[PDB]
Amino acid sequence: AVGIGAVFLGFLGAAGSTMGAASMTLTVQARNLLSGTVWGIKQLQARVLAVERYLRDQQLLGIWGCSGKLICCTNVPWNSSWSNRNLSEIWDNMTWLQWDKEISNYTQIIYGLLEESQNQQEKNEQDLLALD
Amino acid sequence: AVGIGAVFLGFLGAAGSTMGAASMTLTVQARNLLSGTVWGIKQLQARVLAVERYLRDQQLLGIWGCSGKLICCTNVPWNSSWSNRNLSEIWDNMTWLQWDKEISNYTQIIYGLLEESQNQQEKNEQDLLALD
Amino acid sequence: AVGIGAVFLGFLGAAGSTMGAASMTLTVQARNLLSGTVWGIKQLQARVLAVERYLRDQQLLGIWGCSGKLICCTNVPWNSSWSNRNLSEIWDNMTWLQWDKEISNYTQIIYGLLEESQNQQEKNEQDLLALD
Amino acid sequence: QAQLQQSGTELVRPGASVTLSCKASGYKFNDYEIHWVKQTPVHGLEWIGAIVPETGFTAYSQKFRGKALLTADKSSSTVYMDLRSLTSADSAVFYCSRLQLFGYFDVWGTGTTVIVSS
Amino acid sequence: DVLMTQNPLSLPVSLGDQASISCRSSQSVVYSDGNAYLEWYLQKPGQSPKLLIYKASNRFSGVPDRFSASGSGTDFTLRISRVETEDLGLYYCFQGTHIPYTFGGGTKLEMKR
Amino acid sequence: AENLWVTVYYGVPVWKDAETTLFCASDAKAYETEKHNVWATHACVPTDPNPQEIHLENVTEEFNMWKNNMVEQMHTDIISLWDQSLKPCVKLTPLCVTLQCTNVTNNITDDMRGELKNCSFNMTTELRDKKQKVYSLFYRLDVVQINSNKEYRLINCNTSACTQACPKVSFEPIPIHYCAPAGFAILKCKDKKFNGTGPCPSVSTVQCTHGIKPVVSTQLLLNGSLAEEEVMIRSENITNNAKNILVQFNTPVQINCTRPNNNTRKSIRIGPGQAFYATGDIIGDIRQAHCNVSKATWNETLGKVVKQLRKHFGNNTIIRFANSSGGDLEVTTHSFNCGGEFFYCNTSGLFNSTWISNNDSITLPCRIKQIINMWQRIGQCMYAPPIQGVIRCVSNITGLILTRDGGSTNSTTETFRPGGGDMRDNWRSELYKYKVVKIEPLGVAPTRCKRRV
Ligand SMILES: *[C@@H]1O[C@H](CO)[C@@H](O[C@@H]2O[C@H](CO)[C@@H](O[C@@H]3O[C@H](CO[C@H]4O[C@H](CO)[C@@H](O)[C@H](O)[C@@H]4O)[C@@H](O)[C@H](O[C@H]4O[C@H](CO)[C@@H](O)[C@H](O)[C@@H]4O[C@H]4O[C@H](CO)[C@@H](O)[C@H](O)[C@@H]4O)[C@@H]3O)[C@H](O)[C@H]2NC(C)=O)[C@H](O)[C@H]1NC(C)=O
Ligand SMILES: *[C@@H]1O[C@H](CO)[C@@H](O[C@@H]2O[C@H](CO)[C@@H](O[C@@H]3O[C@H](CO[C@H]4O[C@H](CO)[C@@H](O)[C@H](O)[C@@H]4O)[C@@H](O)[C@H](O[C@H]4O[C@H](CO)[C@@H](O)[C@H](O)[C@@H]4O)[C@@H]3O)[C@H](O)[C@H]2NC(C)=O)[C@H](O)[C@H]1NC(C)=O
Ligand SMILES: *[C@@H]1O[C@H](CO)[C@@H](O[C@@H]2O[C@H](CO)[C@@H](O[C@@H]3O[C@H](CO[C@H]4O[C@H](CO)[C@@H](O)[C@H](O)[C@@H]4O)[C@@H](O)[C@H](O[C@H]4O[C@H](CO)[C@@H](O)[C@H](O)[C@@H]4O)[C@@H]3O)[C@H](O)[C@H]2NC(C)=O)[C@H](O)[C@H]1NC(C)=O
Ligand SMILES: *[C@@H]1O[C@H](CO)[C@@H](O[C@@H]2O[C@H](CO)[C@@H](O[C@@H]3O[C@H](CO)[C@@H](O)[C@H](O)[C@@H]3O)[C@H](O)[C@H]2NC(C)=O)[C@H](O)[C@H]1NC(C)=O
Ligand SMILES: *[C@@H]1O[C@H](CO)[C@@H](O[C@@H]2O[C@H](CO)[C@@H](O[C@@H]3O[C@H](CO)[C@@H](O)[C@H](O)[C@@H]3O)[C@H](O)[C@H]2NC(C)=O)[C@H](O)[C@H]1NC(C)=O
Ligand SMILES: *[C@@H]1O[C@H](CO)[C@@H](O[C@@H]2O[C@H](CO)[C@@H](O[C@@H]3O[C@H](CO)[C@@H](O)[C@H](O)[C@@H]3O)[C@H](O)[C@H]2NC(C)=O)[C@H](O)[C@H]1NC(C)=O
Ligand SMILES: *[C@@H]1O[C@H](CO)[C@@H](O[C@@H]2O[C@H](CO)[C@@H](O[C@@H]3O[C@H](CO)[C@@H](O)[C@H](O)[C@@H]3O)[C@H](O)[C@H]2NC(C)=O)[C@H](O)[C@H]1NC(C)=O
Ligand SMILES: *[C@@H]1O[C@H](CO)[C@@H](O[C@@H]2O[C@H](CO)[C@@H](O[C@@H]3O[C@H](CO)[C@@H](O)[C@H](O)[C@@H]3O)[C@H](O)[C@H]2NC(C)=O)[C@H](O)[C@H]1NC(C)=O
Ligand SMILES: *[C@@H]1O[C@H](CO)[C@@H](O[C@@H]2O[C@H](CO)[C@@H](O[C@@H]3O[C@H](CO)[C@@H](O)[C@H](O)[C@@H]3O)[C@H](O)[C@H]2NC(C)=O)[C@H](O)[C@H]1NC(C)=O
Ligand SMILES: *[C@@H]1O[C@H](CO)[C@@H](O[C@@H]2O[C@H](CO)[C@@H](O[C@@H]3O[C@H](CO)[C@@H](O)[C@H](O)[C@@H]3O)[C@H](O)[C@H]2NC(C)=O)[C@H](O)[C@H]1NC(C)=O
Ligand SMILES: *[C@@H]1O[C@H](CO)[C@@H](O[C@@H]2O[C@H](CO)[C@@H](O[C@@H]3O[C@H](CO)[C@@H](O)[C@H](O)[C@@H]3O)[C@H](O)[C@H]2NC(C)=O)[C@H](O)[C@H]1NC(C)=O
Ligand SMILES: *[C@@H]1O[C@H](CO)[C@@H](O[C@@H]2O[C@H](CO)[C@@H](O)[C@H](O)[C@H]2NC(C)=O)[C@H](O)[C@H]1NC(C)=O
Ligand SMILES: *[C@@H]1O[C@H](CO)[C@@H](O[C@@H]2O[C@H](CO)[C@@H](O)[C@H](O)[C@H]2NC(C)=O)[C@H](O)[C@H]1NC(C)=O
Ligand SMILES: *[C@@H]1O[C@H](CO)[C@@H](O)[C@H](O)[C@H]1NC(C)=O
Ligand SMILES: *[C@@H]1O[C@H](CO)[C@@H](O)[C@H](O)[C@H]1NC(C)=O
Ligand SMILES: *[C@@H]1O[C@H](CO)[C@@H](O)[C@H](O)[C@H]1NC(C)=O
Ligand SMILES: *[C@@H]1O[C@H](CO)[C@@H](O)[C@H](O)[C@H]1NC(C)=O
Ligand SMILES: *[C@@H]1O[C@H](CO)[C@@H](O)[C@H](O)[C@H]1NC(C)=O
């Protein structure tokens, strides 16, 4: 038998699993994002829009200093205001859908903090490079 | 009041400011680059061309070893022939438009030097990795 | 005279040269990949498909931890099963076409090994970052 | 020495929950995934669920989804089933079995005869 | 969903003869990878099920050449030659490609005296 | 340790409700010739075989078959396919001419008196300076008298010119699969008692939907999917009588429709490369078209739907079935296409019953038309060429489209009448279990990581 693990390795197969376990199948969704007269026009528009969305996401990741990485550790400390929940709870009980629902309110704040942290790190790198 | 700083943070808001100050709003233009029957065909062609231009710029940056960075320090020394101007002058008096007008002549030379420097650094990395 | 080196620096100019020598003209092909009613529709479809192919290749490279690099050294050891051939033979006698013909069978195995190695390295980085 | 050990017989009242076990020994626990099959004479052999100890992924079948709760402990190399709301139809023999990706049920357990009676 | 039909319910056979078990799938079992994961399992009275053949063609581990399986897609058949006393038990066919997996109806091998 | 930091994840399995442009897929076998079909699409890519369906454990999703997209898209795609299949065909502008019609008393039955007219008219030939006197048989529903002599004209001549359907193109529906593009997923509700709206505890993700046949009909869903467990009553707002009630059967009801007339086709050259396919003399007796359903099977099915409706309208309620109140022929009759012929059947015998709180067949007569106004549009009419021989088709009644009448106060009686006309309800009966979501691969979560300086 193939086994039920292949299901876990399928597209969105870990959507119901704990986010800690779902963190091991990021590449599946990441690759699915680029999978590949009026009807042709509509199909082409959809493809172009998908490409634009992927490029915007990649540009954001690069702007945070996370270019080329699927998991990127940052310098922004976690605020208890966003979520006072424990680490074990988050990474062994909840799923990414539940977590997204919980933290959807603070997402823009976190994005701005990441941008500011990357800018500060870039200028600190440039200033230490003003010193060496 | 919102304040005049939000104007500085707008698209091209720093076009008239000193390049030293304009260096702190690069992300605005970088993000604007990806902002998002005959009429539909023309719009789609424009979008595809914009995507192609952005990808060409990113490929160039990567070819210089500057992938994912908005400010990238390099190993290519600055030639006095390109501009004998001081550092304070450049980064506290001129703007990026004036500077582009001044150095438009040597841009291809600088690009070739950056490519050669990145190739040399890559092969030196590979050769030190031939030694470790 | 311009010299025969400019031919070596042309598109596919090193296709017949030894892969060791052809490794010094990767940027030419890399840049050519992005070079730039029914007829317009077909041209637009071709351009979109080219962009999608380039983005898929870049995503693969990033998934292997090789983002932004044309030559990327990895942690995956070379299996003698794939090719028992020597190093001098490969990099001073054969060409990339011959080598591709030889190793076409094991390409997917190597790709999977690269993905697994990058995942292991990413989680080891995250775990050492669980320790610092 | 790959072997799977499970409890022999558990007698409980209807409407209660029972916790079985399947001890994995003699082989790396992580690599294989443990499946369970019931042995009954009326419904035949049926697959209940299968767990991967690494990620904890739990796959079930609609024929026993819900009440069936499967848990594992990596440290002790154990897989358990917690079956709730038992009825007379649940009295059967449960075999815990191991499997590998694109593999086969090479080794099985001794079975666990469960009786639902007050 | 994948109904695993096994016939006959009982398969009388004399010692040293050949017994054939037929097992038909409702739909195709071939997985995307190209392999068909259909397995035959035998349960002796008082013993847990034992794997016999995996992939519907490969022998589990030095199982007798008597135990040979063949078929394709919808139809799969298991053949047992030179029936011995140790072959008594219930034969079950099982497919392992589509979730939920299912077991065969079951064939009861009966030796003849 | 207590100091937690933001970690960025790309590829997270999270999604949101979204609308996109799904791409159709058709079975590979459909590519074996038979390119002459209204629904045969070159755009539709071959169906990926051994389709994979991943079950999402512990996932609960909110579905809404009534606000669902991917039904409007299906309607638009079907309409566009219909128009595309009609572009190359002959435009019947010359057919808008005076006709000298007379009754066909040629071994007709009492129920077919005046239904067919024998009309003679002058027609253009392949030469611009020559005219031909020709005759054709026209159904009374297609000709209107204009006022001794008796002159008629085609019903459409004061609205638009009809486009003759290409005789080789087939109207037989073929399954069509809708597939999600990159960055999107299709979620299927696997609950077998799902009433079309609200949470769905059992969910799965599929690359493409099941093959949905674009069957066009009214008052009766034909050749559709069947409920797995029980008859399903689905409505946007059951209390609101203005909302149609979609009924899905668990077992099909066979309906046998035939056109017993042995029709003869006649080709008339309208111009250079233009042919008009007229109806010649009918070989044999002339008899009414009709459809048959089993009396006992229909009674059992009606009892079951009544049982399921009482759950919404109280146990001690009188449930009545009545025929359509009125409207155009399309909505007041069970419309459908049977082997290229368009039927309009009087279902007054199917919906004639009152239910108290505690080998025969039903023959319902049908009428034929050749001028067709599809999709409730005006100004785009299609002329259906006649078909030689006897027409016969067998279908399954897999559901109903009902409408409840507004009662004063609580009159302990509810009367339901057949409805339809809007084909979006026909697609909605097959796409109720599907929804489209957009992936949101970017996720930020606390981890005990920190980056370097
Ligand atoms: C619900 O679903 C049911 C079943 O899917 C469906 O009933 C079926 O409808 C189709 C379409 O009308 C029927 O197919 C037609 O069948 C007749 C009869 O012959 C068939 O059956 C015999 C005996 O089984 C077979 O031996 C034979 O091979 C056929 O399968 C055919 O005469 C029809 O062929 C003509 O039309 C085709 C349209 O594509 C053409 O491709 C074909 O070439 C034929 O046209 C040619 O000949 C014509 C006559 O000479 C001529 O006028 C044309 O110009 C052309 O030259 C067609 O294959 C099928 O039999 C039905 N099955 C049953 C069991 O009834 C229901 O219609 C459907 N309900 C709804 C509402 O959609
Ligand atoms: C719809 O209405 C049209 C009218 O336009 C009908 O078509 C006419 O049908 C009648 C009756 O079938 C036809 O009359 C018959 O014509 C046959 C062919 O005509 C040739 O032969 C006659 C001499 O007989 C010539 O004058 C003529 O120019 C042709 O060369 C004749 O063979 C028939 O004669 C037979 O019957 C008569 C009856 O008295 C006998 O005396 C004869 O000996 C012989 O047995 C007969 O005359 C007429 O031709 C048709 N006209 C056209 C234009 O088609 C359709 O039938 C009608 N359809 C329906 C469904 O109602
Ligand atoms: C959908 O289908 C239903 C039935 O399945 C139709 O309902 C029927 O509609 C007709 C009207 O079209 C009703 O009228 C019946 O007409 C018969 C024919 O009438 C001719 O013959 C009589 C002489 O017998 C002449 O007087 C008359 O002028 C016509 O020339 C009548 O014979 C019927 O009368 C019978 O019943 C009455 C009442 O029981 C007796 O008194 C008579 O003696 C005779 O036995 C009758 O009048 C018919 O009744 C309707 N049927 C039902 C069951 O209600 C729908 O109209 C149809 N829908 C559409 C849109 O067409
Ligand atoms: C098709 O075209 C023909 C030819 O134009 C039409 O026939 C013509 O019809 C008119 C009027 O019906 C005829 O005029 C009448 O002639 C009679 C007989 O002499 C006379 O008594 C009347 O007072 C009137 O003048 C005309 O003669 C006739 N011509 C021919 C050659 O037949 C025909 O009506 C058109 N329509 C159809 C359906 O054929
Ligand atoms: C299909 O099934 C869904 C749920 O399975 C039905 O929706 C639910 O309908 C009930 C009432 O029938 C709603 O309860 C009501 O809630 C409101 C607000 O809390 C309250 O004020 C009312 O007194 C009543 O308790 C329930 O909220 C609602 N759930 C959802 C998710 O919408 C739906 O009515 C069914 N439709 C059909 C046609 O069967
Ligand atoms: C499903 O349909 C029913 C019936 O159409 C809806 O209930 C109706 O809701 C309207 C409000 O939109 C009620 O009208 C109001 O009535 C009160 C008291 O009579 C009056 O003071 C207001 O000015 C207004 O006219 C109507 O009475 C009520 N009828 C019934 C039978 O409930 C229901 O809201 C619909 N459900 C959804 C989810 O839309
Ligand atoms: C729908 O059902 C009606 C009956 O409700 C069918 O009408 C019946 O059709 C058969 C065969 O076409 C007729 O049989 C004939 O009977 C006479 C006298 O016995 C015999 O001499 C003929 O050789 C032929 O066998 C029958 O008379 C006729 N009427 C009745 C009342 O049975 C109709 O055919 C059905 N149509 C469909 C599409 O199911
Ligand atoms: C609609 O038409 C179909 C034919 O395509 C009818 O099915 C056929 O119905 C006849 C009955 O006249 C069946 O013949 C009978 O078979 C039984 C055994 O099932 C036998 O005991 C009888 O003596 C008789 O020979 C025939 O088998 C059946 N065939 C199929 C494929 O269904 C159907 O009854 C028609 N339905 C209506 C409502 O008119
Ligand atoms: C729904 O069923 C009712 C009852 O069966 C139908 O009512 C009947 O409708 C017919 C035709 O509309 C009436 O026929 C009569 O025809 C003569 C012919 O000239 C006409 O002069 C009369 O004014 C009348 O239309 C029949 O009398 C009538 N019967 C009753 C009791 O109302 C109704 O037509 C059916 N509607 C549909 C859409 O099926
Ligand atoms: C809808 O249902 C009604 C009632 O179930 C049907 O009306 C009934 O039709 C039958 C059949 O003709 C009538 O029986 C006949 O009565 C006459 C005397 O009037 C008798 O001479 C005949 O031998 C036969 O027994 C019945 O009286 C009549 N009842 C009523 C209240 O109208 C109606 O035909 C059905 N309509 C359809 C389209 O099925
Ligand atoms: C209308 O409803 C009838 C009855 O529900 C449908 O006929 C049924 O079609 C299915 C699928 O084609 C048949 O199952 C098949 O059986 C054969 C063995 O004969 C098996 O080899 C296939 O793998 C499949 O399981 C089913 O037997 C058949 N029912 C009967 C009584 O023959 C029909 O498909 C529906 N659609 C129409 C009429 O358009
Ligand atoms: C030919 O058909 C016409 C109808 O198209 C018959 O004329 C009358 O039509 C009305 C309705 O339109 C009926 O109510 C009458 O019963 C019909 N007959 C009469 C005499 O008015 C006409 O009778 C039919 N026969 C002929 C020879 O023309
Ligand atoms: C409809 O009428 C046509 C008349 O053309 C019939 O076709 C004839 O059928 C007979 C007997 O099968 C043959 O001997 C003739 O050669 C046929 N002629 C033609 C031109 O095809 C046809 O069979 C009739 N249809 C039905 C159902 O009775
Ligand atoms: C956390 O949020 C509070 C409230 O917005 C704010 O005052 C504080 O500065 C934040 N701290 C960090 C580390 O983000
Ligand atoms: C600067 O430019 C001059 C003139 O082109 C050239 O000779 C010299 O090598 C250049 N030096 C550097 C460091 O670029
Ligand atoms: C540039 O800096 C030097 C510092 O030694 C100074 O002498 C010179 O004047 C400056 N340039 C100008 C244009 O003043
Ligand atoms: C090399 O290939 C052989 C045969 O597939 C395999 O057994 C071995 O593990 C491989 N080793 C490496 C380092 O890839
Ligand atoms: C590869 O190098 C080894 C060095 O020990 C040598 O013995 C061998 O001959 C070389 N391969 C070939 C094909 O000569």
Give me the domains of chain E, ranges plus CATH numbers: 4-111 (2.60.40.10)
Start-end of H helices in F328-444: 329-332, 424-431
Is residue E36 within 8 Å of E71, Cβ to Cβ? no
Determine, yes or no, domain membership for B36.
yes
Q: Tell me the C-alpha to C-alpha distance, in Å, between residue E80 and each of A27, E4, E18.
A: 46, 20, 6
Q: How many residues are present in chain A?
A: 132
Measured from the Cβ of residue A24, the count of other Cβ atoms closer than 10 Å reads 18
First-to-last C-alpha distance (Å) of chain A: 60
- Residue whose C-alpha is closest to residue F195's, from F226, F236, F223: F236
- Reduce the secondary structure of F34-72 to three states and give it as a string: CCCECCCCCCCEECCCCCCEEEECCCCEEEECCCCCCCH
Q: Per the structure block, which two tokens stand in for C81?
A: 């099963």
A57 contacts F6? CB cut-off 8 A: no
Q: Do the beta carbons of residue F57 and residue F13 sit within 8 Å?
A: no
- What gap in Å lies between CA B72 and CA F115, rounded to an integer? 85
Q: Is D2 on the interface with E (CB under 8 A)?
A: no
**Inter-CA distances, C83 with A122, C19, C23, C89, C115, Å:** 44, 15, 19, 11, 20
Chains A and F are touching, with contact defined as 3 or more CB–CB pairs separated by less than 8 Å:
yes
Cβ contact, residue pair F450, C126, below 8 Å? no
Subunits with 3+ Cβ pairs within 8 Å of B are: A, C
Nearest ligand atom owner, CA of B90: 16
Residues in chain E closer than 8 A to F52 (CB atoms):
32
Indicate whether C3 belongs to any domain.
Answer: no
Backbone CA torsion sign across D101, D103, D106, D108 = positive
- Per the entry, the structure determination technique was cryo-EM
Total residue count of chain C as it appears in this document: 132
**F342 with F370: CB under 8 angstroms?**
yes
Give the closest of A2, A21, A24 to D101, CB-based.
A2
* Residues of chain A positioned with their CB less than 8 A from the CB of B74: none
Contact F445, F12 (CB under 8 A): no
Q: How far is the CA of C9 from the centre of ligand 15 (A)?
A: 23
Superfamily of domain D3-116: Immunoglobulins (2.60.40.10)
| Beta strand pairing call for E10-14 and E107-112 | parallel
CA contacts within 13 A on the Cβ side of C3 = 4
Tokens standing for residue F358: 């505690």
Q: How far is A7 from chain E (nearest CA, A)?
A: 9
Q: Which residue has the tokens 């086969």?
A: D104
Q: Which residues contact D10 (CB under 8 A, 6 or more apart)?
A: D18, D20, D112, D114, D115
A73/C37 CB distance under 8 A:
no
CA of E67 to the centre of ligand 5 (A): 59
Domain span at residue C58 reads 9-132
Q: Shortest CA distance to F438 belongs to which of F67, F6, F13? A: F13
Sorted by sequence, the CB contacts under 8 Å of residue B101 that are 6+ apart come out as: none
Q: How far apart are CA B14 and CA B22, in angstroms?
A: 5
Do the domain assignments include residue A2?
no
Substitution target in D33, D48, D57 with the highest count of A β-carbons within 10 Å is D57
3-state SS assignment for residue F281: coil
Q: Which residues of E touch F50 (CB under 8 A)?
A: 28, 30-32
Domain annotation covers residue C4:
no
What's the rounded Cα separation, in Å, for the pair F138 and F371?
10
Report the C-alpha gap between F77 and F80 in whole angstroms.
5
F385: DSSP letter: P
d(CA E34, CA E27): 15
Is residue B58 within 8 Å of residue B67, measured between CB atoms?
Answer: yes
**Cα separation of A84 and A103, whole Å?**
11
User: Residues F414, F317: contact at Cβ < 8 Å?
Assistant: yes
The residue nearest atom 47 of ligand 1, judged by CA position, is: F388
Tokens of A15: 């959507």
Which of F9, C47, B33 has the alpha carbon at shortest distance from A55? B33
Q: For residue F43, give how far its alpha carbon lies from the nearest alpha carbon of chain D (Å).
A: 36
Nearest alpha carbon to residue F263 among F163, F161, F370: F370
User: What is the dihedral angle through the alpha carbons of C79, C83, C86, C92, rounded to the nearest 10 degrees?
Assistant: -120
D47 close to E100: Cβ distance less than 8 angstroms: yes
Whole-angstrom Cα distance, residue B90 to residue B51?
32
Q: Helix H segments across F255-382?
A: 295-313, 329-332
Q: Is residue A84 in some structural domain?
A: yes
Residue A89 belongs to some domain of the structure:
yes
Spacing, Cα F153 to ligand 3 middle (Å)? 30
Between chains, do A2 and E39 touch, taking CB under 8 Å as contact? no
Distances (CA, A) of B93 to A87, E107, F234: 51, 92, 72
- Ligand 15 lined by B80 (C-beta under 6 Å): no
Q: Do chains F and E touch (3 or more CB pairs under 8 A)?
A: yes
- Separation in Å, CA of F363 to nearest CA in chain A: 43
Structure tokens at E107: 């064939």
Instruction: Name residues whose C-beta falls within 8 Å of residue C130's C-beta, 6 or more positions apart in sequence.
Output: F448, F449
Ligand in nearest proximity to the CA of F351: 10
Quick one: tokens of E31? 């997985």
Tokens 């035949």 sit at which residue? D44
How buried is residue F295: exposed, middle or buried, by Cβ count under 10 Å (0-12/13-18/19+)? Answer: middle
Cα–Cα distances (Å) from F353 to C110, F201, F397, F415, in that order, read 72, 38, 18, 10
Task: List the single best residue of C58, C59, C119, C129 to mutate versus F (max F Cβ within 10 A).
Answer: C129
Looking at ligand 9, which atom is closest to the CA of residue F348? Answer: 39
Indicate yes or no: CB of B129 within 8 angstroms of CB of C73.
yes
Q: Which residues contact B29 (CB under 8 A, 6 or more apart)?
A: B11, B12
**C-beta of residue F15 within 8 angstroms of C-beta of residue F440:** yes
DSSP helix/strand/coil, E15: coil
Residue nearest to atom 1 of ligand 14 (CA): A79
Structure tokens at D43: 């419904």
Peptide bond into F214 cis (omega under 30): no
> What tokens appear for F70 in the block?
């991917």
Residues 6+ apart with CB under 8 A from E92: D44, D45, E6, E40, E41, E42, E43, E49, E103, E104, E106, E107
Distance linking the first and last C-alpha atoms of chain E: 40
Asked if the C-beta of F130 comes within 8 angstroms of chain A's C-beta atoms, the answer is: no
Buried b (16+ CB within 10 A) or exposed e, F188-202: bbbbeebebbeebeb
Phi, psi (deg, nearest 5) at residue E112: -110, 135
F244 lines ligand 5 (CB under 6 A): no
Atom index in ligand 10 nearest the CA of residue F352 equals 1
Residue D19 φ then ψ, to 5°: -115, 105
Look at chain B and report how many structural domains it folds into.
1
List subunits contacting chain F, requiring 3 or more Cβ pairs under 8 Å: A, C, D, E
Residue B4 lies in a domain: no
Do the Cβ atoms of A2 and E31 come within 8 Å?
yes
**Phi and psi at residue F229, to the nearest 5°:** -115, -55
The Cα-based distances of F80 to B21, F87, F196 in angstroms read: 56, 11, 27
Closest CA to D106 of D46, D26, D8: D26
Tokens 């990806």 sit on residue: B34
Q: What is the DSSP string of F232-278?
A: EEE-S-TT-TTSPEEEEEEEEEEEEEEEEEEE-EEEEEEETTEEEEE
Q: What is the least distance, in Å, from the CA of D59 to any CA of chain E? A: 9
Q: Resolution in Å, one decimal, please.
A: 2.5
Number of the ligand closest to the Cα of F331 = 9
Span from the CA of C26 to the centroid of ligand 15 (angstroms): 26
C75 lines ligand 17 (CB under 6 A): no
